[PDB]
Amino acid sequence: GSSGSSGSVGKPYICQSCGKGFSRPDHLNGHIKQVHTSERPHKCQVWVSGPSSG
Numbered sequence: 885g886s887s888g889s890s891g892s893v894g895k896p897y898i899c900q901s902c903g904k905g906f907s908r909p910d911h912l913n914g915h916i917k918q919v920h921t922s923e924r925p926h927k928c929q930v931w932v933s934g935p936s937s938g
């Protein structure tokens with residue numbers, strides 16, 4: 885029951901976001917920065933802000 889365990893013969897650079905595929909590094913990048921591009925929240929400019937953590 886494998887029916888898998890294979891890739892694509894041509895475009896090795898496969899997007900690690902959706903699964904797309906490209907031939908060049910820059911080409912794929914644009915897609916990840918043109919389609920996947922988005923904004924995400926970050927820490928308060930520090931590892932721990934509260935009383936303690938770890």
Ligand SMILES: [Zn+2]
Binds near residue numbers: 903916
């Ligand atoms: Zn993608």
